[PDB]
Amino acid sequence: MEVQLVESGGGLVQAGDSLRLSCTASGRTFSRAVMGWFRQAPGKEREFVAAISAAPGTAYYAFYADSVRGRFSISADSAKNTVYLQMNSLKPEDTAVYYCAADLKMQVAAYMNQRSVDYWGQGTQVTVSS
Amino acid sequence: MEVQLVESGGGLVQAGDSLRLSCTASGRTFSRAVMGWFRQAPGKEREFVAAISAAPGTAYYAFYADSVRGRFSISADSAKNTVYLQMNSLKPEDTAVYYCAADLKMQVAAYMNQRSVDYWGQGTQVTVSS
DSSP states (O other): BBBBBBEEOOOOEEETOOEEEEEEEEEHHHHEEEEEEEOOOOOOOOEEEEEEOOOOOOEEEEETTTTTTTEEEEEEEGGEEEEEEESSSSSSSEEEEEEEEESSOOOOOOOGGGOOSEEOOEEEEEEEEO | OOEEEEEEEOOOEEETTTTTOOOEEHHHHHHEEEEEEEEEEETOOOOOEEOOOOSOOOOEEEEOOGGGGTEEEEEEEETTEEEEEEEOOGGGGGOOEEEEETTOOOSSSOOOOOGGOOOOOOOOOEEOOO
């Protein structure tokens, strides 16, 4: 079985600035899963950031953790089987290894525990200096 | 929550060589979960490698994937809350990112589904040169 999630983006950023992450998934996984983002701060467990789920037609449902509401935008593109996280107004507190996630059981975007995740992309370092 | 699993070790070795990896777990996870290793080969989804019974003190079961049987061995140091993956007679085909994992819903060493894993350590690159 081929790797299901392939992620892109990351790097060093100044406080206040923006950075975009993205992740592709296989056709089968993209269509069968709620896609999400998690982050692992230094010395901490990975915690939920945001999720997005397909709805009938062109529609999507999005859900954000309290830490990131307003400042981040999640989106998806069916034609490219890709999910995106645009992060804005970044703070030193946002420094972490960021992971994309696929959850086959969940149907509608909601808070996601890491134990419910079926597939992970490879983690990527995002560093925000003051 | 503090990070549960911290991996150590990795690098480039030659075919026929050996290498031991390690991973520390919180006291709580060491006593409660089956611990194991997975590996993610280039362009492939991560696969089960080895597992060890919960609370591996003076005695434990160990279990292995067919592709690593006899060459690979898993053990533990209870006093250091640490599990080890010993890899003998390495082949170019063992080249992969190696992950340690814990599943709190398992007690006896056995095949681990990646979907059922509660906690992950950060991947470590092992490259075996032809």
